[PDB]
């Protein structure tokens, strides 16, 4: 009879109301993906931000969710993360001399190239973190590992006068850090059509203000996305 149809309609209405509530709850949550090598220091960034691994943290009453897929040389699940606001990329800038066999930093640059020139994620910005700044400073000041020996581009590289360095009190460490950042920026600029941007941040394990950096940067990402959607940028 029609009693079964009426019961099914009532159940459908209840499920639709629950789905509307879930949509309201979920549309305000922003998804972030944490990507990096095992020795990069993603655990340190996760600990700093919190204070598959699912993490809830909110800034200014805005809920962000962070994912950590964690060998997987052929990344086939990278197409699953297509609705995330930004992808957090963590690389140890002090790992230029250490090589496993091809420097680890060069392998991270190749991974960044693969992520950037990905067909499935072409509107997904990348938040770049360079951990182990203190270790990089110690390595550069010591001079045991010549930066030009592993990266030949350092021989002709000059420090950027446009960017004011932090008070590191050493021109050499600033030059090395800015060269490492400029490598990623040069990879990002080649395919940059304005849809997605790469934001380099120099961070340290002692530093804990990375959460505000992520919040502000995600705000800028959404603002740029809206501006390009309305064709004002």
């Amino acid at each position: 009879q029609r009693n079964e149809e009426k019961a099914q309609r009532e159940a459908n209405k209840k499920i639709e109301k629950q789905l509307q509530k879930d949509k309201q709850v979920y549309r305000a949550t922003h998804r972030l993906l944490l990507l990096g090598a095992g020795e990069s220091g993603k655990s340190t960034i996760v600990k700093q931000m919190r204070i598959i691994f699912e993490t809830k943290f909110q800034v200014d009453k805005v809920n962000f969710h962070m994912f950590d897929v964690g060998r997987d040389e052929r990344r086939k699940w990278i197409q699953c993360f297509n609705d995330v606001t930004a992808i957090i990329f963590v690389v140890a800038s002090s790992s230029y001399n250490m090589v496993i066999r091809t420097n680890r930093l060069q392998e991270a640059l190749n991974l960044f190239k693969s992520i950037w020139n990905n067909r499935w994620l072409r509107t997904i910005s990348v938040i770049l973190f360079l951990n182990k700044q203190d270790l990089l400073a110690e390595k550069v000041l010591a001079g045991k590992s010549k930066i030009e020996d592993y990266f030949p581009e350092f021989a002709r590289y000059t420090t950027p006068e446009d960017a004011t360095p932090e008070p590191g009190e050493d021109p050499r460490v600033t030059r090395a850090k800015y060269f490492i950042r400029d490598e990623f920026l040069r990879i990002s600029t080649a395919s940059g059509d304005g849809r997605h941007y790469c934001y380099p941040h120099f961070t340290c394990a002692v530093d804990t203000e990375n959460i505000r950096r992520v919040f502000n940067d995600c705000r800028d990402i959404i603002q740029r996305m809206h501006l390009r959607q309305y064709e004002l940028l």
Partner: protein, 281 residues
Amino acid sequence: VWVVGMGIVMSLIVLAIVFGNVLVITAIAKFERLQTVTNYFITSLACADLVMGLAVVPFGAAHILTKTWTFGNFWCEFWTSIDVLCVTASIETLCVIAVDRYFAITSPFKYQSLLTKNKARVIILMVWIVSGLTSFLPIQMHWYRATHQEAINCYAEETCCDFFTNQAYAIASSIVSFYVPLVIMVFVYSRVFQEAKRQLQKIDKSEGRHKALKTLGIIMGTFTLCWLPFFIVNIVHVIQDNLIRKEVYILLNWIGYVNSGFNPLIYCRSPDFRIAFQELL
């Protein structure tokens, strides 16, 4: 033969307005990918422009060409009310679209929660309700009629039907319809331009190794140069001026009408809209 040649312009304007608005309405209606929060406002604006282009443009053109109004007095009042309602709704929808854009850009994190489908429907219903009030209530109740002998004679005559209004109603209609939305649009677009300039400066600083100005300029120009002269002549001839000839007033009103053939194609320039238009035709 001048009117015969002139009549072609009005026919072309009406055809263009109807075709553009129908195409836009079909574009949003047919494809579910186009439906969105702001596309509801866009389709409301398209509906208002279509209504005005269908109703008041042909009737006004016929009145101008024949130099007389064949239909009845009640139908003339209905035509005037429809004209006011459509103009007010169109400009208010422009203002609402500008406010939505400003809220989406300046406050992106809260933008998803601030406006939803229910919120957009409520806003559209409120806009149409206030437009319908401001149009019909002062007209159908004869609150806009003037005490001058010329206005009384014009109302008494069955054939001739021109627009005669009080200073108070003209001022109120102007401020409700155009002036307040003009202020709101200018403010929100100035804020949006400031945000865009800040973002461009930040991007230049970060990756040193415009378009926003052009878009805001074309939007503000096609709104202002189309409506502002008419809505300043409104107050001018309402308040202590007789130099405003009827021809100038009608010409500026028809420029305002022509704005309805310009709003769609500038508000549907997105690549998705172009793809939908290509698929439809």
